Short mmCIF file of C-alpha atoms and ligand atoms in Angstrom, two decimals:
data_model
loop_
_atom_site.label_atom_id
_atom_site.label_comp_id
_atom_site.label_asym_id
_atom_site.label_seq_id
_atom_site.Cartn_x
_atom_site.Cartn_y
_atom_site.Cartn_z
CA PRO A 14 -64.43 13.59 -16.28
CA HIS A 15 -65.36 10.32 -17.96
CA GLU A 16 -68.62 8.44 -18.46
CA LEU A 17 -68.15 5.13 -16.70
CA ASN A 18 -69.55 2.04 -18.30
CA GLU A 19 -70.97 -1.02 -16.50
CA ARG A 20 -67.70 -3.02 -16.51
CA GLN A 21 -65.93 0.04 -15.07
CA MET A 22 -68.42 0.66 -12.26
CA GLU A 23 -68.44 -3.03 -11.38
CA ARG A 24 -64.68 -3.14 -11.11
CA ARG A 25 -64.63 0.05 -8.98
CA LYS A 26 -67.29 -1.23 -6.66
CA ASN A 27 -65.69 -4.69 -6.34
CA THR A 28 -62.21 -3.26 -5.71
CA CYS A 29 -63.50 -0.92 -3.07
CA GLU A 30 -65.44 -3.73 -1.29
CA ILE A 31 -62.26 -5.84 -1.12
CA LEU A 32 -60.07 -2.98 0.18
CA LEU A 33 -62.70 -1.89 2.69
CA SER A 34 -63.34 -5.30 4.10
CA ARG A 35 -59.58 -5.84 4.49
CA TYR A 36 -59.30 -2.44 6.19
CA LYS A 37 -61.99 -3.25 8.75
CA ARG A 38 -60.33 -6.53 9.65
CA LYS A 39 -56.84 -4.99 10.02
CA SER A 40 -55.90 -1.45 8.99
CA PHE A 41 -52.91 -1.41 6.61
CA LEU A 42 -52.84 2.28 5.66
CA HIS A 43 -49.55 2.96 7.39
CA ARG A 44 -47.80 0.50 5.11
CA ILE A 45 -48.97 2.01 1.82
CA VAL A 46 -46.50 3.61 -0.54
CA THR A 47 -48.21 5.20 -3.50
CA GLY A 48 -47.23 7.18 -6.59
CA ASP A 49 -48.11 8.47 -10.02
CA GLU A 50 -46.89 10.61 -12.95
CA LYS A 51 -48.02 14.12 -13.91
CA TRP A 52 -46.89 16.58 -16.56
CA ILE A 53 -45.53 19.97 -15.41
CA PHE A 54 -45.32 22.68 -18.12
CA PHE A 55 -42.49 25.29 -18.44
CA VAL A 56 -41.46 28.15 -20.89
CA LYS A 57 -42.29 22.37 -23.22
CA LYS A 58 -42.96 19.98 -20.33
CA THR A 59 -41.37 17.56 -17.91
CA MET A 60 -42.85 14.46 -16.30
CA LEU A 61 -42.95 14.38 -12.52
CA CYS A 62 -42.89 10.79 -11.23
CA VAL A 63 -43.35 10.79 -7.43
CA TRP A 64 -43.87 8.28 -4.63
CA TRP A 65 -44.94 8.96 -1.09
CA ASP A 66 -46.48 7.67 2.09
CA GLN A 67 -48.18 9.05 5.16
CA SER A 68 -44.86 10.61 6.31
CA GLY A 69 -44.02 12.52 3.09
CA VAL A 70 -42.42 12.17 -0.31
CA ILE A 71 -40.01 9.21 -0.41
CA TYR A 72 -38.59 9.73 -3.90
CA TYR A 73 -39.29 11.55 -7.14
CA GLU A 74 -37.86 12.06 -10.59
CA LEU A 75 -38.44 14.87 -12.99
CA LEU A 76 -37.71 13.49 -16.43
CA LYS A 77 -35.97 15.41 -19.21
CA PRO A 78 -38.31 17.52 -21.28
CA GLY A 79 -40.49 15.50 -23.58
CA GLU A 80 -39.24 12.10 -22.02
CA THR A 81 -41.90 9.50 -21.23
CA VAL A 82 -42.02 6.52 -18.78
CA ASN A 83 -41.57 3.23 -20.67
CA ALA A 84 -41.29 -0.25 -19.21
CA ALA A 85 -37.51 -0.06 -18.75
CA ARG A 86 -37.67 3.34 -17.13
CA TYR A 87 -40.37 2.34 -14.64
CA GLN A 88 -38.40 -0.78 -13.64
CA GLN A 89 -35.39 1.35 -12.83
CA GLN A 90 -37.56 3.85 -10.97
CA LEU A 91 -38.93 1.11 -8.73
CA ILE A 92 -35.36 -0.02 -7.98
CA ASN A 93 -34.31 3.49 -7.18
CA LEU A 94 -37.46 4.03 -5.08
CA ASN A 95 -36.55 0.96 -3.02
CA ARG A 96 -33.04 2.40 -2.31
CA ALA A 97 -34.66 5.68 -1.14
CA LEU A 98 -37.15 3.76 0.97
CA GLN A 99 -34.30 1.91 2.80
CA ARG A 100 -32.60 5.20 3.56
CA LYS A 101 -35.72 7.17 4.61
CA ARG A 102 -38.00 4.55 6.21
CA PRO A 103 -36.34 2.26 8.84
CA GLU A 104 -39.36 0.25 9.49
CA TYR A 105 -38.68 -1.15 5.96
CA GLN A 106 -34.83 -1.50 6.09
CA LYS A 107 -35.26 -3.77 9.04
CA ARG A 108 -37.92 -5.76 7.16
CA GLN A 109 -40.05 -5.44 10.19
CA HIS A 110 -42.64 -4.60 7.53
CA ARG A 111 -43.79 -5.30 4.08
CA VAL A 112 -44.52 -2.47 1.65
CA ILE A 113 -48.03 -2.21 0.22
CA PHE A 114 -47.78 -0.51 -3.16
CA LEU A 115 -50.58 1.47 -4.76
CA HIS A 116 -50.15 2.57 -8.36
CA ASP A 117 -52.39 2.71 -11.32
CA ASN A 118 -52.40 0.24 -14.11
CA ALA A 119 -50.77 2.26 -16.90
CA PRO A 120 -49.18 -0.27 -19.32
CA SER A 121 -45.61 0.46 -18.10
CA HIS A 122 -46.78 -0.34 -14.54
CA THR A 123 -47.91 -3.81 -15.50
CA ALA A 124 -45.38 -4.93 -18.16
CA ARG A 125 -43.68 -8.29 -17.65
CA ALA A 126 -40.29 -6.89 -16.50
CA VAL A 127 -42.01 -4.56 -14.01
CA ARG A 128 -44.24 -7.37 -12.64
CA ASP A 129 -41.01 -9.38 -12.13
CA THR A 130 -39.29 -6.53 -10.33
CA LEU A 131 -42.28 -6.05 -8.04
CA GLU A 132 -42.30 -9.84 -7.31
CA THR A 133 -38.63 -9.67 -6.45
CA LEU A 134 -39.02 -6.60 -4.25
CA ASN A 135 -41.98 -8.57 -2.85
CA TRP A 136 -44.17 -5.60 -2.30
CA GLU A 137 -47.89 -6.28 -2.01
CA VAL A 138 -49.57 -4.64 -5.03
CA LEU A 139 -53.06 -3.35 -4.27
CA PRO A 140 -55.81 -3.60 -6.85
CA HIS A 141 -56.73 -0.43 -8.63
CA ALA A 142 -59.56 0.21 -11.12
CA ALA A 143 -59.34 2.01 -14.39
CA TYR A 144 -60.53 5.61 -14.52
CA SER A 145 -60.27 5.99 -10.74
CA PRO A 146 -58.13 9.05 -9.85
CA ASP A 147 -60.73 9.59 -7.10
CA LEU A 148 -59.31 6.41 -5.49
CA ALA A 149 -55.61 7.33 -6.10
CA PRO A 150 -54.14 9.53 -3.33
CA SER A 151 -51.64 11.08 -5.73
CA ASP A 152 -54.54 12.39 -7.80
CA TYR A 153 -57.24 13.34 -5.27
CA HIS A 154 -54.83 14.67 -2.66
CA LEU A 155 -51.27 15.42 -3.80
CA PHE A 156 -51.71 16.64 -7.36
CA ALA A 157 -55.11 18.28 -6.53
CA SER A 158 -53.22 20.58 -4.03
CA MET A 159 -50.23 20.96 -6.41
CA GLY A 160 -52.30 21.93 -9.43
CA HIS A 161 -53.67 24.99 -7.70
CA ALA A 162 -50.20 26.10 -6.63
CA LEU A 163 -48.79 25.47 -10.14
CA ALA A 164 -51.36 27.61 -11.89
CA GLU A 165 -49.53 30.83 -10.73
CA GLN A 166 -46.05 29.62 -11.91
CA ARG A 167 -44.35 30.27 -15.20
CA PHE A 168 -41.17 28.29 -14.98
CA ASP A 169 -38.12 29.38 -16.89
CA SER A 170 -36.28 26.06 -16.82
CA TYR A 171 -36.22 22.46 -15.68
CA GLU A 172 -34.20 23.69 -12.69
CA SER A 173 -36.87 26.09 -11.60
CA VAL A 174 -39.44 23.25 -11.61
CA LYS A 175 -37.17 21.04 -9.44
CA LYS A 176 -36.52 23.85 -6.97
CA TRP A 177 -40.16 24.66 -6.74
CA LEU A 178 -41.07 21.00 -6.11
CA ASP A 179 -38.42 20.55 -3.42
CA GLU A 180 -39.73 23.62 -1.66
CA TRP A 181 -43.36 22.76 -2.09
CA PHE A 182 -43.10 19.16 -0.87
CA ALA A 183 -41.08 20.21 2.13
CA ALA A 184 -43.42 23.02 3.16
CA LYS A 185 -46.32 20.60 3.63
CA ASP A 186 -46.70 19.41 7.24
CA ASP A 187 -46.54 15.68 8.04
CA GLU A 188 -50.28 16.00 8.72
CA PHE A 189 -50.94 16.80 5.00
CA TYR A 190 -49.45 13.52 3.84
CA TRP A 191 -51.06 11.50 6.61
CA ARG A 192 -54.56 12.93 5.76
CA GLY A 193 -54.14 12.12 2.13
CA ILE A 194 -53.52 8.45 2.81
CA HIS A 195 -56.01 8.12 5.64
CA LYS A 196 -58.78 9.56 3.39
CA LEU A 197 -58.80 6.16 1.59
CA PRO A 198 -61.47 4.36 3.67
CA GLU A 199 -63.99 7.16 3.34
CA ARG A 200 -63.52 7.17 -0.39
CA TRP A 201 -63.77 3.35 -0.63
CA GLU A 202 -67.08 3.66 1.35
CA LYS A 203 -68.43 6.33 -0.93
CA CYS A 204 -67.59 4.31 -3.98
CA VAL A 205 -69.36 1.20 -2.61
CA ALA A 206 -72.39 3.39 -1.71
CA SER A 207 -72.44 4.83 -5.30
CA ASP A 208 -72.27 1.21 -6.65
CA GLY A 209 -69.09 2.20 -8.44
CA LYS A 210 -70.11 5.55 -9.90
CA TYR A 211 -68.10 8.71 -9.23
CA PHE A 212 -69.15 10.52 -6.10
CA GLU A 213 -68.95 13.84 -4.36
C1 RLT B 10 -57.89 2.99 -17.38
C2 RLT B 10 -57.74 4.28 -18.09
N1 RLT B 10 -57.59 4.76 -19.35
N2 RLT B 10 -57.54 6.16 -19.22
C3 RLT B 10 -57.68 6.36 -17.88
C4 RLT B 10 -57.73 7.57 -17.02
O1 RLT B 10 -58.06 7.43 -15.81
N3 RLT B 10 -57.38 8.69 -17.70
C5 RLT B 10 -57.43 10.02 -17.25
C6 RLT B 10 -56.74 11.02 -18.12
C7 RLT B 10 -58.57 10.39 -16.34
C8 RLT B 10 -56.22 9.83 -16.19
N4 RLT B 10 -55.34 8.81 -16.40
C9 RLT B 10 -54.22 8.57 -15.64
C10 RLT B 10 -53.41 7.49 -16.11
O2 RLT B 10 -52.39 7.21 -15.53
N5 RLT B 10 -53.84 7.02 -17.29
C11 RLT B 10 -53.08 5.95 -18.00
C12 RLT B 10 -53.82 4.66 -17.92
C13 RLT B 10 -54.47 4.13 -19.03
C14 RLT B 10 -55.16 2.94 -18.92
C15 RLT B 10 -55.22 2.24 -17.73
F1 RLT B 10 -55.91 1.09 -17.61
C16 RLT B 10 -54.62 2.78 -16.61
C17 RLT B 10 -53.90 3.97 -16.71
C18 RLT B 10 -53.95 9.34 -14.44
O3 RLT B 10 -52.97 9.24 -13.54
C19 RLT B 10 -54.88 10.46 -14.18
O4 RLT B 10 -54.74 11.31 -13.21
N6 RLT B 10 -55.93 10.67 -15.04
C20 RLT B 10 -56.68 11.87 -14.49
O5 RLT B 10 -57.84 5.23 -17.16
MN1 MN B 11 -51.34 7.83 -13.74
MN1 MN B 12 -52.85 10.78 -12.09
#
């Protein structure tokens, strides 16, 4: 979409080198939990806030129409996400494993109270470059598939959106979610080979 400047390409390329070199030393893809926000329009619009891993959607919220994510809201979301994670992913209840968290750096995602919450949860937060939805599984995989399916829908209500999302998420095979995460290394490689430009 955007015309990347030098600082932006540098940061993309450097981030991807770091993630890729880590990956080659010891793959960590199975420990990533990732998420992002997207507007869904009906009749007005509601923000979908969703988090997922290679096994499926862990937790989501659909905010009241017009409502936005601010710092306080994101902090509570992360807390609620962690409760869902304990219930749905045993490997993490048992603290056999540490969560690796991939989200973008929207201001609410980096505010002081949110940084504190992440420190306390003690999730590892992966680096992520500005203007890089091609590096964010929610964008290049989850919402890319969703957007096509949404384009046919004309939702009557907030309830219709929620129903549709429950159904849609659940109809995807485990393989869909796994592919979206495990696409990361190829994309990190492409980005390093483009010196940080966008790529096909
Ligand atoms: C940086 C920066 N500035 N604009 C952007 C950007 O990438 N915008 C566009 C609209 C492309 C975009 N954005 C977000 C997103 O969250 N943007 C909020 C945000 C703003 C600043 C910041 F540092 C990080 C995040 C998406 O999720 C997304 O899918 N897209 C497509 O990146
Ligand atoms: Mn975003
Ligand atoms: Mn996005």
